[PDB]
């Protein structure tokens, strides 16, 4: 129902090893559709999803111009932040930026995003009002004054409320057979004895899209959050995702445990038990 578009920029300095690398990737929901890498033999925006290929040469040339410009801009920004923090020219540092729009299940703009980080720490973020900034420290405050002076917020707001939503809806239509298709998880429970009086119940969810999913174990109807081992949702490599949740239970008490699965693709939440 709900959909989002997001661009992720990573700019990485590397003194003694050339100018900072700039990488940009674009996603609709959990589907990447473009990439750009300033380190590539011949740097250009490239397609990473079938439905984007139909876009014309104007589209690709415009994207590449933007990312090439960004490559240079982010190199200057890296120099700037090094200075803001009085850091050595010997160190490697990273600026990250993520921005994009969220749509509701009806297609309307839910909210916009634009956040930056430096060395993995929040640095500056456009507020939900799309009009004001939140700066993490006195360094980010300098960036803030700069951006206020250039009326950056006003331009992001125009983008996020306009072009971002328009293009997202276009992509959603062009890729509707996949982007607007929720694949439910294939689920089962496996049993792995660990000792004479304990065994592991592992609840599996496989082949689902999008990545958002809830896997929980209950014992006698009570959530076992603190005793459940929950691995991070991982990509299968075919656009689908995998996840499992495990609990160590007393042997013979297996039937007191139930696994519960919530996923957008499910006509109704699932309850599973180990089936000997």
């Amino acid at each position: 129902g709900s959909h989002s578009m997001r661009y992720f920029y990573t700019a990485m300095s590397r003194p003694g090893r050339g100018e900072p690398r700039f990488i940009a990737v674009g996603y609709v929901d959990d589907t990447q559709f473009v990439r750009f890498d300033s380190d590539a033999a011949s740097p250009r925006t490239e397609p990473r999803a079938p439905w984007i290929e139909q876009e014309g040469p104007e589209y690709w040339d415009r994207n590449t111009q933007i990312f090439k410009t960004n490559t240079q801009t982010y190199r200057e920004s890296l120099r700037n932040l090094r200075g803001y923090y009085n850091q050595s020219e010997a160190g490697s540092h990273i600026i990250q930026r993520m921005y994009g729009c969220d749509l509701g299940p009806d297609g309307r703009l839910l909210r916009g995003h634009d956040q930056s980080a430096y060395d993995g720490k929040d640095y500056i973020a456009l507020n939900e009002d799309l009009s004001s900034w939140t700066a993490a420290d006195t360094a980010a405050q300098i960036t803030q004054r700069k951006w206020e002076a250039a009326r950056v917020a006003e331009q992001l707001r125009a983008y996020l409320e306009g072009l971002c939503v328009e293009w997202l809806r276009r992509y959603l239509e062009n890729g509707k057979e996949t982007l607007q298709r929720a694949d439910p998880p294939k689920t089962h429970v496996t049993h792995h004895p660990v000792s004479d009086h304990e065994a592991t119940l592992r609840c599996w969810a496989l082949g689902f899209y999008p990545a958002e999913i809830t896997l929980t174990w209950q014992r006698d109807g009570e959530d076992q959050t603190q005793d459940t081992e929950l691995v991070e949702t991982r990509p299968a490599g075919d656009r689908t995702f995998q996840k499992w949740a495990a609990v160590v239970v007393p042997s013979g008490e297996e039937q007191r445990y139930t696994c519960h699965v919530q996923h957008e693709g499910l006509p109704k939440p699932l309850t599973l038990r180990w089936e000997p």
Partner: peptide, 11 residues
């Protein structure tokens, strides 16, 4: 489609 930097806006 990505956002164009305004003219051309460093941190």
């Amino acid at each position: 489609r990505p956002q164009v930097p305004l003219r051309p806006m460093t941190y």
